[PDB]
Amino acid sequence: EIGACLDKAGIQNSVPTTSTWKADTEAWNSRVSPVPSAVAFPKNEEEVSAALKCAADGGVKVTTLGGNRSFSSMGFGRNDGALIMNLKHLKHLEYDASTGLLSYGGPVMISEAANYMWSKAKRTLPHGRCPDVGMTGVAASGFGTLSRASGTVLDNIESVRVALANGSIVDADAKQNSDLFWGVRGAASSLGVVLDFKIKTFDPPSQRVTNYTIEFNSSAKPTQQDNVDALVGTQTWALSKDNSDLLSIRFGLNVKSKLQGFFYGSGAEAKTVFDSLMKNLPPSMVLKTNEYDFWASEAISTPGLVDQTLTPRRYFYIASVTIPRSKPLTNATAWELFSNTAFAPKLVDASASGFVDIWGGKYAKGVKADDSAWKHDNNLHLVRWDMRSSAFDVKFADSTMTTMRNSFYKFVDAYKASGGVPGGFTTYRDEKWTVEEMAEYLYGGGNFAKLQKIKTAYDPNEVFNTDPQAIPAL
Template sequence: MVPTPDGHTLAVRRGDPRRRTLTLTTLDVSALRNRFAGQVIAPGDTDYDSARGLFYGGTDTRPAVIVRPTDPTEVAGVIALARETGLELAVRCGGHNPVGLSSVDDGIVLDLRHLRAIAIDVDERTVWAQTGLTAGDVTKAVAEHGLAVGFGDTGTVGIGGITTGGGVGFLSRRHGLTIDNVLAAEVVTADGQILQVDAGSHPDLFWAVRGGGGNFGVVTRFKYRLHELPGVVGGMLMLPATPDVVHGFITEAAAAPDELSVIVNVMPAPPMPFVPADLHGTMVVFGLVCYSGPADEAEKVLAPIRALAEPIADMVRPIAYHEMFMGDADGDYHPTATARTLFADRLDHALITQVLERLETAPAPMRVTQFRPLGGAISRVADDATAYSHRGRPFMVNVASFLDGPGTRAEREQWVRDTSALIANGEPGAYVNFLAEDGTERAREAYPGGTWERLTQIKRQYDPGNLFRRNVNIPPAG
């Protein structure tokens, strides 16, 4: 990308460099600012570097232009711009994709952050929310009425990205995935149509955007079902990481009532103020606990987990649900890691022991294996009801190793692959929202069997030219 001396006209490479078909496209940024009422940001602008920044480190993409539309009509206009110029299009909500798919070199970033309207119907227990909002934004807004919808476990993720990928989080065992609470959506398609979709209108597209990622259009707002939730008993519970403790934590949580969801992170103890200095760097269970049932029942449900070992720290208490989103205020945190997501049908004591041995001897100072018991309401939905088709899998596991620079990537990736291979059992599978650099090769694991075939047919109908390809891509059938 080469800015001209006046800083307003950009000469941009486009095409497929692998086929040596690069051509030159000129973008008149001044004309774009007249074309769109929303913000247009280009190289040379004072806010360009902050606007192109993403949550995760390790990527340094330089878009030709970033456009922040003000309404769905302008979203359609940005899509039309991509068609006219042939420049690659990336769609950004919260910017949390681990490999930077929400930005693009020499292309167009459609940044939804200015689409922030929210309309709560307390009597109907629904909310229409535009996809420039984050999970934290929506959670706090509906909490004022004692209501909730489950997203994930991080408040800064955009609701568009987490919802289109499925939405596994703290309320999933009780109320299902985020997509199980979607009643309708507004979608701007590759040809610029603005469609209202639900079970009775464009039902195939409605099915596909619930789990199929951003392959089928730009969702500009969702209508969610809300649930009464005055508060939860939740927070962080840190225990020493022994095979008995880790296996017991996972087993007890999986057998608990649906109201309990946990995330069991096994990792070196961070140097937090409440962690004794002699434990820094030792392996601990950094557990995130959320009990969404009556507060007076939480103690009984959590007792078997607390009894596994003397806690290093126990911060589980009655809190507002949005307080489960920990550590969202630090905008300077940009971790760089290599990771792999998978499902497992079995996590027995012997396997946990082997995983702990690998964690103890791993090459990276910071590494983690995360266990998420699933089941509950997730498993009571048919595999073919949405594009998320892993309903019966009892456990999700994520393995990550943080990098100390590009020179450490190869050894850290190998450790992640080997550890994941040790854990994997049952049919291959992947949660699309957690796929990283392996997204292309594992897309069929995210969408197995008939799910993949149906998605490719819907892709052919709504995006035959594969305009929306900066994602875990599902190509059009044929």
């Protein structure tokens, strides 16, 4: 039926009959498998509106595909029976030297954007650390090595061009369709088919880049306390006058934790930075560094960048929260994090691992709660803990993910108990959030109500409600 309306309009489409149905509806997380009603492949903006009319006519719900690297298979549902908007014909990358803006859309990959910007203008741009993530999907937040210095991916979106539920295609930015743009910066999937993003680009912040590892020396016998002190001390440094936003810090959460990242600088500059950080750390930890040119370092931070490499599918689950600078970790809450992650009993049939990405810095201090639908003002930490099996065709029981989830939220609850009001990270959204949880974590500070108001205005028939976490209308 939906497939017949589409065929009527001249729109290339896949339905369960089509010989390529299986390949066209394969999501990245093998644990979450939406069966959609159809996949549309519009060739221009006319076909985008014509496909949405078919869905509106039929009552079919719509979601649109980015790079198909959702940690929770969001791009295909997750509810069954949706129309999938595959924008592969609208793929583009265009750098406007007058504005410094990169314009992009369709299933454009992080690695593709970086290689273009590099060979076009020897420039960089905010991006995550997986090469095959879609730039459109990661603009729901997006944390990279330069984010302490330059903001998240979402923070650098200057405008979008959106196809709406009734076929109108509009431009939105801070000056025009401003409430829709606000909503798109955090709830894009609930609001339109976004056909174009404009992200700000940057000259590399240094010629040379020092990548580093800080870890306990091989003879140290680190306890839980030693690990806590390394985390709290890293926090102390980031909050100190010694802090540099040119230092990315991924704090690997393990019984022998370690810090890894990149300093955008060389020579004595890095040595002064590393020195003030080490002096905040347990005395048994040791620093190791290497030095590369800027572009080579990008292939280190984003492995597989230069060959635009693909990531294997995973039987996967992630839970994540942000720590706002309004409640930094205390030794007690830092302790609860370790007890529930690295020092938790191992999972019977999955590997759990993760890190605290250190956030903070000047840019985040100047993000206001209401700058976007996604509330991300003045964050200090990004906590990620995930589980995976060894192979996409190897599963772990639901009860295993339950156990892991209850442990992580024991930490979150202790953090709350300490006074903290944890936030969320859209690209690391908890697939098991209720709406109550999704609003508190992603859309706090009264953002959610304003979000519903914008939803009710721009999609009142809930065409864009393919997921239990899609924003409901009034």
